């Protein structure tokens, strides 16, 4: 399979890594990424609990909401971290860490 990461709209910030590996993107998670992750997961668990009370399955509903929130929050944090490493999002921290290591 031939691949090509090249985007239609070029990055407006310095490109620290054109096609960062999965584990590199995850290790690039910042405090703000974890805050987004945790907030999305917590809101999802809360919605699961509250919507589960009337059917009587608040626990399992919490688990289902938490799974949805975990997947969505991880995808959002990955999106942000990868976009920063690729230069699509403001990436002052990535540039600073890159100019030193």
């Amino acid at each position: 399979m031939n691949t090509d990461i090249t985007a239609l709209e070029k990055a407006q910030y310095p490109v620290v890594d054109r096609n960062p590996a999965f584990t590199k993107v995850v290790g690039n998670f910042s405090t703000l990424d974890y805050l987004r992750f945790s907030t999305i997961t917590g809101i999802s668990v809360t919605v699961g609990y509250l919507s589960g009370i009337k059917p009587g399955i608040k626990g399992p509903s919490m688990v289902t909401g938490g799974l949805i929130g975990l997947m969505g929050g991880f995808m959002y944090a990955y999106q942000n971290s990868a976009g920063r490493l690729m230069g699509f999002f403001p990436n002052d921290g990535e540039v600073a860490s890159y100019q030193k290591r």
Binding site: T31, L32, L35, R36, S38, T39, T41, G42, I43, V45, T46, Y49, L50, K58, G59, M62, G66
Partner: peptide, 29 residues
């Protein structure tokens, strides 16, 4: 003395985490 409903306690923790994480998200952005 103690709240015994474990699922309710977990939901309380989740709501608190959502609130505090939202505050931090606003503050650090």
């Amino acid at each position: 003395k103690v709240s015994e409903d474990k699922n309710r306690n977990y939901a309380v923790v989740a709501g608190v985490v959502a609130i505090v994480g939202s505050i931090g998200w606003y503050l650090k952005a």
